[PDB]
Amino acid sequence: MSNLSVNAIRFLGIDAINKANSGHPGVVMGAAPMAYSLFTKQLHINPAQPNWINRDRFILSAGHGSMLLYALLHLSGFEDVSMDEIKSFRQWGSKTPGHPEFGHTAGIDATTGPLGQGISTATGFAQAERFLAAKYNREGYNIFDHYTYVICGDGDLMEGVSSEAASYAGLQKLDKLVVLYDSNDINLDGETKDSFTESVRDRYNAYGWHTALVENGTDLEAIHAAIETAKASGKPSLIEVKTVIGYGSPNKQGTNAVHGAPLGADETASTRQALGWDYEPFEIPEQVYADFKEHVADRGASAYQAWTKLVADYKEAHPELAAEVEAIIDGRDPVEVTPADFPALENGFSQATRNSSQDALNVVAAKLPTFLGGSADLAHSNMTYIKTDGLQDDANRLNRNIQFGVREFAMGTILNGMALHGGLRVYGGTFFVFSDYVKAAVRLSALQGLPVTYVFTHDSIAVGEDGPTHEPVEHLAGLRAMPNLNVFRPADARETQAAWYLAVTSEKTPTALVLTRQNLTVEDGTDFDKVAKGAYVVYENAADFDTILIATGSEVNLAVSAAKELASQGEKIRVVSMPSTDVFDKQDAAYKEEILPNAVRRRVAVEMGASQNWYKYVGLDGAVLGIDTFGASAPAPKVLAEYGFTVENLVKVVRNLK
Amino acid sequence: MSNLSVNAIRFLGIDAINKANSGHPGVVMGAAPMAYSLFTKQLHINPAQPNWINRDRFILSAGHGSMLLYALLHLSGFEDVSMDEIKSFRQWGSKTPGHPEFGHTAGIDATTGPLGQGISTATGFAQAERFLAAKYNREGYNIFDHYTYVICGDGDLMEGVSSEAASYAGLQKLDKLVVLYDSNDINLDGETKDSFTESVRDRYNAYGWHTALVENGTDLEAIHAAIETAKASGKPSLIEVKTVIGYGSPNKQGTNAVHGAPLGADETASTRQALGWDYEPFEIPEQVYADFKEHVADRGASAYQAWTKLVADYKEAHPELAAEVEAIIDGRDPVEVTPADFPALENGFSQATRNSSQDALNVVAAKLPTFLGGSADLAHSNMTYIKTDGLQDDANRLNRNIQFGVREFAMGTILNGMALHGGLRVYGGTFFVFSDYVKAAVRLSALQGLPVTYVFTHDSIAVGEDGPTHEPVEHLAGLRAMPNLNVFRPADARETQAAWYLAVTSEKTPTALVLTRQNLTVEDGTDFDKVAKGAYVVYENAADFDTILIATGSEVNLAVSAAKELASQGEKIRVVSMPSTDVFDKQDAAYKEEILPNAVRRRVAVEMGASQNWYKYVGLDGAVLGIDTFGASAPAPKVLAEYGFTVENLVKVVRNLK
């Protein structure tokens, strides 16, 4: 049934796209042979156990060909993809959305669609398998041992993020990563002669990868032999496969006219005739089902039974490892972090919060053996090192510090890949101003529900001499507006302890930590336990106050000092600290009225950044002291004075509000 | 002497860094020889005419080495860089800030610092020179004829954006671009053996560039021979030059200890002794000044005078071209576009604003011959094509459509380069959700004062079937908070003509245009001339109204329909269309009170995106109908209803306000 099975894939895609009147047929018709060869000869997957921790992983980086993956899962027997769901492709509430989504459809390993990020994120899947294998395997017990596979297209290899990833992966020697490249000479606006003329395989040779060419994209035995050679090469692999987009369409194959529109009735009838397919829409003969059940489902189910018997014997042979590995198979952390792990700090202690962050992340690393991370060539200024280890690489696989090089975007995608695999907790650092370079991978953290921790230091004009290209202004507003992201800006060393404890116990929300270069003073009124509420009171001189100051981070020290001045003139005032706007917004309506009462409308907000998001708390009769221009090159005390952040100026702002 | 002059560059940098107690000496000491060779043998520049339009252009991509460029401009005789300004490195108000700034200091061609963007933006400098040479040069009169040169480091070639640009430039065959790569085997956290082991020159061959190697980085004759070869090769060039970082420091050279901290007093005394330099800080001998006066200053003035005579002869031989070239040398556009160029539109006309956008920009291209643009493999969906032309390349240099491929970040830097050169007006398009991929280049557009126009289509959940990875939510709030960026979201075709007219007449502010997939209706009350105020009234049934609706884009149609329904039941209501929050915030205080009177506090805002920025206008006693979750994969009419964007739900929201 090989030709028969291959065409069953093609026509399930074509007919499903015609009925939704929406979708992408070209890639399904071109890539069906190489995907059939991969599912029937390489992958070990079990449709009765779709989340098996030691299954082979697969990522469709060219996410617009989603109907190719849906057809393969239906024919193999996955429960969530019935024929009724194939007939509901791209409709409200279905299991078959227009681009693949993780956690919504059982059997799908990663959310794709944004070009470049699929092939990049697969690097982290492969690295996560290497660490777990080095920590836990023993002689005769290969508990963690599997491959990572991907299919990509022309668009993926034009995007810069995938060049970053391939350079890093060649240095790291990740020999279990295997990529199939659909090379059909067409993209959305036309032919690659006007867009993409480089030699792709010569470039990948310079990174230290294995490369090869398959001239006839419909030859099943040539495709299998190349994959076998790639797995024996000792290097990450890129196999270029020449295909015809829209293969079988007499009037439109080889043209961009089949890239992203349904074929329609007249061309669909001409395509059936040319390929010899006389079955009606959604009619698949029994021969094809029996082919997929022998070579995918039964093969995958046999490998799963042998793995479970292996794990049972492993727990008997090594009782000192049994507890941790059992937890990981349950989907839990091997060890539990608690508030009692962090020492108490004294009022008046003076420390910059980048240094407070290093102290707290070293407490976590000593307690939890599956916590790891790195930086983008800024470890010596972010202060991200775990001080008991060196650098991780092919010759030192258990170390927990990673050097990413100057590659912020790919760093985001690799963390996502390590979090998707299962078993680990991860983090990564850079300067706050260059969060623009990684913003699109932060969105995929928020979309897939991954608790990844981003470490952004050097947060304001207090940077000083480096100047406007190195000084953040607009960046907090941009991040606070993104759904399912929690942004923390702690006020001293004590608030920094709490934010790390929340970041490392989060269930399905990523965290961004915003930290200072200059020293800050531990306040008498801050409190570890109250940070989990998002905002709380740190100063108040009279229970009948009529004035409220709101502040975050390094501006909390400034606002408390101004309140004591105003109090000595006879005012009645309260100071609120708000380390997270996103967490405060989720609290109960009773708690919000206790912190910001409706009857007190005299309000002033303070923060060294754009004014935009503070009007939802101060309203039309309040004021905001922020920054709405670019920065300046000079020592930091002078720049702060020229921009209005002094105690004197804040006192003036409050007295002129009435 | 050469050796005497080369050490003058090094110690000027060393001493100025010690006096500020801040800066980066390593790259100055390593790269002084190649920088000296370029200035004395290759560059044609005139210190008395710093903005000469046919000068050779130079970009310092490794921006942390700014003292290397300030020393060179000082010895060459540029007026803004005196010895007093050298003694003011990194101090408030000086002409020598910590990273180079275009516009602030005369003789600086481009702002650098964020790694990768310097070498990338130089691509657009060279493309601008090519287009103006084809259009205006005639036999015997080569008015536009000059090269583009850059110095870069290891960090620049790890960033993804430089791979995108080099691939694009190899296809385009920009043979007058010349790059010197300072290869010192060191980065910020340590040695390149742990970060960057690829074969750089083998990768650049795969793109179609010419490459060469200089093993002894202090041999000035080997350096010169390599650049002459490169300029005759007929391809964009990359020359790898091996240097020792911190050359001369007996205890610190070749380590990351000299990357980013001053040498200090002890090691400076040891370095003066090691290189035989017997002059006190800021003491430069006369022979060095005369070496620079002869070989850069006098040589460039001679080339300038010859160019002025050639232009005068050219304008006598071709009087039909004289007026357009005269305007360009003056820094003005060669033709003026006015409001009477756009045709009037009928109330009720139905058209999507991506299509209105194609009509308006073709009006512009027919009037102004130096207006050009492109798209990142989305021309057939953004609707960006100028319909009288094909694609621009090495064989067809006068066409005005550009295919950038799937390369959003690099697109942004090439636009900035083309606008930095002078003479042109440029634009470029992608989907609004992938503005995340190009955000860091938009920031350089605003920081440098460049009127570059970005075209973002498919702007909300109205995308429908493609799903949440393709549906913008948080993107408007991120862009409106950036200083010096005007964001327009037009309500219909009439409002779209006006936005394009303002975008193309902006003097020093970039523009972002946000446009729809689906059709909208021209309103009775929209008005071409009032768009320049940012917000104005489009519906009002009674002069004593007590309610105000505020809306943008596709939500203006909805708001006017809900308003008419409320009127029929006896209410008195005003509707405000606000195509640009950023321009409205700049109006006179009297005009703000006219549009949003302080005494009317019942206010509802309507927009399909994040709610964050609308509280500045509605306060604590109004409401906002927006979106603060991710989108969904289904037909658009179904998604809009599920999210509450219907006439019936909006009426209800107004009535429940009290």
Ligand SMILES: Cc1ncc(C[n+]2csc(CCOP(=O)(O)OP(=O)(O)O)c2C)c(N)n1
């Ligand atoms: C980052 C990003 N930019 C743009 C797009 C829009 N887009 C989707 S597919 C595509 C064409 C890419 O062509 P190719 O990968 O060669 O696919 P083929 O038609 O050969 O299957 C484009 C521009 C996208 N999905 N992601």
Ligand SMILES: Cc1ncc(C[n+]2csc(CCOP(=O)(O)OP(=O)(O)O)c2C)c(N)n1
């Ligand atoms: C996008 C970006 N990321 C990070 C930085 C911070 N940074 C500046 S220089 C540097 C190290 C790069 O070293 P290299 O370019 O080899 O220079 P060298 O030490 O040889 O002078 C880093 C990480 C930056 N300026 N821009």
Ligand SMILES: [Mg+2]
């Ligand atoms: Mg293709």
Ligand SMILES: [Mg+2]
């Ligand atoms: Mg270097």
